[PDB]
Structure 1
Amino acid sequence: HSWRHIRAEGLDSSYTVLFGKAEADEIFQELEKEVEYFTGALARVQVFGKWHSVPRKQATYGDAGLTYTFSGLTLSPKPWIPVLERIRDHVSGVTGQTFNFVLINRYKDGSDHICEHRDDERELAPGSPIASVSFGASRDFVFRHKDSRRVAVVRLPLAHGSLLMMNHPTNTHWYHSLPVRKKVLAPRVNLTFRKILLTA
């Protein structure tokens, strides 16, 4: 059971394949059944002064009593469901890391995507990581650095059943997108777990 450690100036990440085809497939199907995404008005964001709707499908889940601002739109996460607990318990029992909140993204195909984002936030616990889990289609994850100087970009194929671990830094211009890959045709579900403040 092996890990890859990702390092560049300001960057610390740890990719691994947590799940074999045995359960990752079983879980993927159980996710498609049960996960309820946001629709219409709740699936919208304000970026650069306009409202758009997300080129994907989103959901939030978590412990009771929390709120999460996502790009100028604040909701309360839906209570946990048996499959999300089932996963979280596995991640936690392996990473020794607890989480109260997860943000779920379904991408129907290679043009369903997400845009460059800094985790720069004070909504996360003081020193705590972010666990990114993926199921379905293998898709590229991208890290870009803000600058002024020329240091490279970190591309990463996130496979069916794989865990990516990222540390939250308090001072980093590392942005993360998951760009369009037109050639991809299968669906992809992606759950990033977080530890949220309860102050909200």
Structure 2
Amino acid sequence: MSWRHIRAEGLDSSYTVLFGKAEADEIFQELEKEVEYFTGALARVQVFGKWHSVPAKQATYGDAGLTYTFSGLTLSPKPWIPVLERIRDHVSGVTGQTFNFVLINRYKDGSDHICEHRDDERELASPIASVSFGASRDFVFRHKDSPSRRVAVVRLPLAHGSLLMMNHPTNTHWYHSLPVRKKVLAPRVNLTFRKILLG
């Protein structure tokens, strides 16, 4: 496989094109058709007098019997459906890793974005694999100390059919964003595969 290695102080990611266009088109259509997102209908749930947010506008699938936590609650993901198994297997096939969980986000146009954040490290093992379909969207890495010092910025279009692996310690020293882009009008679907520890 042909990989672009994105390297900098505390940043190890690599990027490749996982699926050719024909196949990326097919899979995208199947995703749009088949994935079931949480609606907005239920925002919060309260226990012991303290509220807890409930996932909205995302879908989670994973292995039977698995549980993950979210905003303090413990959930079960939907069991895998075939298009996701197909995608998981290609990722596995090209990295040597296994994954038991995927978080799917849909960005219906360039107004949908994600603000700077660092993944919830607490429940993970190991590399996060991010697979993109639909419209190309720029993805941005900013160092968590850049205020103290001035560290470089790294900017990467995540293209249709692509795979971005984020390996240690990329998620420890750098925040990530998917910034707004008005010019972009078509939707993007992103799949983030993880391995949730049984411990």
Establish whether TM, by shorter chain, passes 0.5. yes
What are the residue-to-residue correspondences of 1:1-200 with 2, within 5 Å? Answer: 2-41=2-41, 57-125=57-125, 128-147=126-145, 148-169=148-169, 172-198=172-198
Q: Give the whole-Å Cα distance in 2 for the aligned partners of 1:45 and 1:60.
A: 19
Contact 2:38–2:56 (8 Å) recurs in 1: no
Change (3 A) 1:171 1:17: closer
| Runs of 5+ consecutive residues of structure 2 not aligned to the other structure | none
- Per-residue CA shift, 1:68-101, capped at 9, x if unaligned? 2334454211100000001111111111110000
Q: 1:42 to 1:194 in 2, by over 3 A?
A: farther
Deviation string 1:51-72 (CA, Å, 9 cap, x unpaired) is 9999983111101222223344
Task: Tell which deviates more after alignment, 170-179 or 43-52.
Answer: 43-52
Deviation at 1:122, TM superposition (A): 2.4
What's the offset of the Cα at 1:194?
A: 0.3
| CA deviation after TM superposition for structure 1 residue 156, in Å | 0.8
Task: Classify 1:189/1:173 alpha carbon distance in 2 versus 1 (closer, same or farther; 3 Å).
Answer: same
Q: Deviations over 1:116-135 (max 9, x none)?
A: 1112512111xx21111000
Question: Structure 1 residues 153, 70: CA separation in 2 closer, same or farther (over 3 Å shift)?
Answer: farther
After superposition, the Cα gap between the structure-2 partners of 1:158 and 1:39, relative to the gap in structure 1 and judged at 3 Å, is same
User: Would you say the 8 A contact 1:137–1:186 is kept in 2?
Assistant: yes
TM-fit CA distance, 1:168: 3.9
Q: Say if 1:149 and 1:197 are closer, same or farther in 2 by CA, change over 3 A.
A: same
2: distance between equivalents of 1:161 and 1:11? 23
Q: Quote the offset at 1:175 in angstroms.
A: 0.9
Sort the Cα spacing of 1:54 and 1:152 in 2 relative to 1 into closer, same or farther, 3 A: farther
Go from structure 1 to structure 2 and tell me whether the alpha carbon gap of 1:154 and 1:170 turns closer, same or farther (over 3 Å shift). Answer: closer
Quote the Cα distance in structure 1 between the aligned partners of 2:46 and 2:5.
Answer: 35
TM-score w.r.t. length of structure 1: 0.87
Alignment check: 8 A CA contact 1:58 1:104 kept: yes
**Unpaired segments of 5 or more residues in structure 1?**
none
Q: In 2, Cα distance between the equivalents of 1:138 and 1:170?
A: 22
Distance 1:50 1:134, change over 3 A: farther
> Structure 1 residues 136-145 or 115-124, which shifts more?
115-124
User: Secondary structure of the equivalent of 2:165?
Assistant: strand
TM-score by length of 2: 0.87
CA distance in 2, matches of 1:66, 1:92: 19
Contact kept, 8 Å, 2:13 with 2:170, in 1: the verdict is no
**In the alignment, is the contact (CA less than 8 A) between 1:47 and 1:71 conserved in 2?**
no
Tell me, in whole angstroms, the C-alpha distance in 2 between the residues paired with 1:50 and 1:146: 30
